[PDB]
Amino acid sequence: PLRLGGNGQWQYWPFSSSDLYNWKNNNPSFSEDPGKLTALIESVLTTHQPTWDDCQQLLGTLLTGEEKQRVLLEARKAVRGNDGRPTQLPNEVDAAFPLERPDWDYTTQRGRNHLVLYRQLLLAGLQNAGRSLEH
């Protein structure tokens, strides 16, 4: 999580393990009921402003390896180019939705801007994977 500090600086705080444990174990699996975990994750992305690593941890905890892989792959399918339309250009896809830890600096606006886009894409990916599972 990212939090605006009392000194005007953005601070990184890791998820608490009790929160992670509870989110997973108080909830049905993603495959069994995609809507419940999707809603949970959407709220977490909003309220906790997680970093790229937080998102990996959140997905890793709540999803199985197969679920998580589908979700990230769907997220990358959601990347758009300048024309406001889909792109499959590796450099554009990787730039918006990196699968490897990026160099994004949470203390900077550029870095928080990348994070906002990444979380929007992740949510789309989650929604879209959920729908496939639902039909």
Residue numbers in the entry: 1 to 135
Quoted passage from the original study:
Mammalian cells show different susceptibilities to retrovirus infection. N-terminal β-hairpin and a core bundle of six α-helices. at positions 82, 92–94, 110, 114 and 117, can change the tropism of MLV.
tryptophan substitution at amino acid position 10 in CA. of the CA-NtD of this variant at 2.0Å resolution. RMSD of 0.6Å across equivalent Cα atoms. of the channel the aliphatic L10 side-chain forms the base. L10 in the base of the groove is shown in red. hairpin together with R112 and T107 from the α5–6 loop. residues 8 and 10 in the β-hairpin. forms part of the rhTRIM5α binding site. defined Fv1 binding pocket must be extended to include this region. observation that huTRIM5α restricted the L10W mutant virus.
